[PDB]
């Protein structure tokens, strides 16, 4: 006895040790790194907003206006459901499942992920 709990605790403390090691190097102490070949500051891709959607047009309030308003906006679908992608699954996989509520939920999550655009 006391084998599987010891191995699982070793796995959990190893994952926690790696999580405590990499974030102090990347984000806490000097906030990034420096490339040796080019003048590019190394930064993790997790804080970079890897996707971009289409353009949005509007109009100013005053007529005969010459000001150009260029800016950014952040959009997300409710910020609660995760990005566990069910969209990389062909439609012939989940056909012999035992329930119908899971057939509702998988298609709901696939529509949630295919409605990433506004």
């Amino acid at each position: 006895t006391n084998w599987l709990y010891q191995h699982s605790a070793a796995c959990s403390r190893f994952n926690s040790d790696l999580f405590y090691d990499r974030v102090k190097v990347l984000l806490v102490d000097q906030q990034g790194l420096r490339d040796a070949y080019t003048n590019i500051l190394h930064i993790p891709e997790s804080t970079q907003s890897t996707t971009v959607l289409g353009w949005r047009r509007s109009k100013n309030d005053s007529p005969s206006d010459t000001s150009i308003v260029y800016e950014t906006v952040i959009h997300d679908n409710d910020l609660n459901k995760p990005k566990t992608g069910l969209s990389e699954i062909p439609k012939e996989i989940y056909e012999d499942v035992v329930d119908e509520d899971v057939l509702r939920a998988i298609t709901e999550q696939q529509n949630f992920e295919k409605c990433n655009e506004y």
Binding site: N15, L33, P44, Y70, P82
Partner: protein
């Protein structure tokens, strides 16, 4: 005989979504049978279904100690005597179907180190008669 003592002592309560109701913690069925047939349809002598059951139980039991942290591949690989070509195919399976990476602290999932993203930078056009902006 072995996981019953492990599941009772230091196991955090299970958070399961609605699209993960097909998952069975005891045995397997036709969804997990058809996804990775290399464990079943005589691919090798080492990819036995009992070792497959041991790994698919060990990963979902290793996640129960830290539900809010990202379960990496290497931390599973430290105490699993299986090929990494199968460890990745099971870890990506459980991440795709939303079991071991559903509700964690999202700053725990690592990404690739590199440059920043250029999506909001102002880029102009080289017109042969001017320098008109690119504003569609």
């Amino acid at each position: 005989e072995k996981a019953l003592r492990f599941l009772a002592k230091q196991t955090h309560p299970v958070i399961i979504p609605s699209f993960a109701s097909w998952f069975d913690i005891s045995k397997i069925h036709e969804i997990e049978k058809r996804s990775n047939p290399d464990f079943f349809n005589d691919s090798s002598r080492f990819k036995t279904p009992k070792a497959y059951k041991d790994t698919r139980n060990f990963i979902i039991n290793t996640y129960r100690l830290s539900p809010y942290e990202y379960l990496t591949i290497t931390a599973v690989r430290r105490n699993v005597a299986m090929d990494v070509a199968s460890i990745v195919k099971i870890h990506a399976f459980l991440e795709k179907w939303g079991l071991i990476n559903y509700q964690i602290d999202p700053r725990t999932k690592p990404s690739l180190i590199g440059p920043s993203f250029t999506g909001h930078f102002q880029v102009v056009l080289d017109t042969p008669q001017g320098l008109k902006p690119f504003l569609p």
